[model samples]
Target: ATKIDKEACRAAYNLVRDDGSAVIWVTFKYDGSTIVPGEQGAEYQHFIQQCTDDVRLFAFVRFTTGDAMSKRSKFALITWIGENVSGLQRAKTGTDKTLVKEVVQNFAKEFVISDRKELEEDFIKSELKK
Candidate 1:
């Protein structure tokens, strides 16, 4: 069975289902052997900067479309493996992500972002629009 925490799952649910929220997110990280929750917030720029080197984590983002006609809510699942993370830790991320997704479910976009430059909000929006 997946080791994701019940509260963590609920956080994901709340963000996905919440109204009047422009941008919101929930991040999940491993706590020893269990995949527990981590930092979560509404600032996309700050959120992108938080995934620094030496850690492996997953993020669920609710991004609102910028334009008028095509405006809608977009969900993004981000997989982060820092540049300085160990080889073994990095290797585990492949399988670990599968477990994380069981709770951070229902997304229109999925991204594996290691560098801050690659985690651009507009870039993600472009991908989601495609």
Candidate 2:
């Protein structure tokens, strides 16, 4: 993807990740054990309380940079969210398709989905930096 496309997709992803409550949103768990975007009410307490830094970091790796396994996994995640989370296939919603496009483009532009493990590992591992 071109830099323009990459940047645009990244921005879209951020918007969705931060404020697209209707679709999905990231629940940030800070290192100090605090949640961002507000506290988890009773409805989400179980889910929110379960989010550890390692879990968030693992997801961050998958989102920011994907491995060969996670490349396929990310595609599966998108398809899963489309089919189950949004129910677009059944509902036939245009918004669903657009969100799906934005998410996939953002992930794809993050890094090349390559066959070589060595090729992607260092790039992904770099995100582990504190």
Candidate 3:
């Protein structure tokens, strides 16, 4: 469950699947009002630095969409390329939903984030070096 209401989530970490495959865990959270804008290029990269390479790009795309996303998200994704140039260097021209599901949805199940409204508080605090 994602307690987006009052939490600054862990955002990403490593987990092992039932078959022992390495999976990267991720989630988003804000106090329902504090949507971190994407304009803070350094801030997005700063936050994603808490996670792995695959997820850094993955999270960048996820947060930089939708009606509310403004220059913040756009500029953030652009600047991120400078920080993780390798992320773009290896990029292909297509996407794979199945792989994303495996990495995101499957891990979300661990916390029942889709169905449960709230999870145990302090599930894992966000990277706190802020």
Candidate 4:
């Protein structure tokens, strides 16, 4: 589960969306006990630095249990190429679904995860709740 700072997330989302980028959600798990003071904030800054003008870091949130056992976090990065660009153009050319499926397949390859059902469900639910 993820808990985002909604206002900040929305502002970043709008910035990336208006810039014509494709959003990709990346999830990372961290141990709360292992994080030293201020390390989380530093990691966030490092993550944002990985992005370029064409690739914008949109939003990030960290989830921690009340007992501080684990941290489940997600970061959304947007790129101008890939699904965002091709998917839109393909839709205009009547190849939208095909192109989108190809992109999804490619994304699966990156994570080495064959089952996309869970990911899709999680993404949809998260967005709706947001």
Candidate 5:
């Protein structure tokens, strides 16, 4: 399996955000504790909550998996955004770019899916990232 770093993911995000040339997909892995009642998830949740602004299309999904042998379990949060826009482009662009970048970086650190091809394929049975 291949691993993705924050910088690389950020670049891809920026490209999709600024150019509107590609879809943006992100998979997140985090300590179960990170998602608590009322908190729902990390600070990233707050960022997504603010998505009613610049983003025109957005989707969030959650999944769980268990290892039959080790009995280990894991949780995942997948976020998909169709486009990114600036304040000048949209009437509701109040989200701070710095905060958005911070949230993205933090989430990217916990998740492993980052390659453009892998992301484009939606992280299916493909080994493009590898």
Candidate 6:
């Protein structure tokens, strides 16, 4: 079985629920045997920069959005596979993410993001609205 830091991911998710702000993203990285905590911050622009860096990552994002009358808080899971990774590496992510979901369980949508554009906040929010 693969080792996942369940507590770390849970802590990240707790922040999303506890904080009223919209700009929060927590990233996780895998290193063969374990999926460990990566970068976490409140800036999507900064978060997007690392998404294309030739590595595999998963993000727990909090997107604060709204309609004409009310404010809405949305959560998302983003699976990032860098363009430079091998096919085999990408192929195994299906299983990797399954294990990841054990802890990162609550979200409006789950996104597999390979392109940099897809990692953008607007793109993610639009997809979540769908």
Write model 1 residue lDDT over 16-130, tens digit each, in one string: 5586654387778888777777777778887876789877888888878857887678888899999999888787887778877777668897888788777788888888888
- Kindly report which residue stretches of model 3 are placed more than 4 angstroms away from their true locations once superposed: 1-56, 60-90, 93-98, 106-130
Q: In candidate 5, what residue range of length 10 has the lowest lDDT sum?
A: 30-39
Write the residue-wise lDDT of candidate 5 on 1-130 in tens digits. 1122445445444433332333333322212312111112223334345333233322222221235664321222233232454434233212222223443433222222222233332353223223
Cα lDDT listed for each candidate: 0.78, 0.29, 0.25, 0.28, 0.30, 0.81
Question: TM-score, each model?
Answer: 0.85, 0.21, 0.20, 0.21, 0.22, 0.89
Q: If both were scored by TM-score, which would come out higher, candidate 1 or candidate 5?
A: 1
Q: Candidate 2: which pairs clash?
A: none
How far residue 70's Cα lies from its native spot in candidate 3, in Å, is 24
lDDT by residue for model 2 over 2-100, one digit each (tens)? Answer: 112334444434544442233232222222422222222223223323333223210112322355665321211122111122333224322333433
Angstrom error of the Cα, residue 85, model 2: value is 8.2
Clash count (model 4, backbone only): 0
Sort by TM-score, best first: what order?
6, 1, 5, 2, 4, 3
Model 2 whole-model lDDT (C-alpha atoms)? 0.29
lDDT of 6: 0.81
Q: Which pairs of residues clash in candidate 3, taking residues 3 or more apart in a chain or in different chains?
A: 1-111, 38-72, 38-73, 39-72
| Top TM-score model | 6
Give the range of the ten consecutive residues with the poorest summed lDDT in model 1. Answer: 14-23
Return whichever of 5 and 6 wins on lDDT: 6
lDDT tens per residue, model 3, 11-63: 23222122132222233322232322221122333444433323222222212
What is the lDDT for 19 in model 4?
20
Poorest lDDT segment (10 consecutive residues) of candidate 3? 71-80
Instruction: Report per-prediction Cα RMSD to one decimal.
Output: 2.2, 14.7, 18.1, 17.1, 14.7, 2.0
Q: Is candidate 1 or candidate 4 better by lDDT?
A: 1
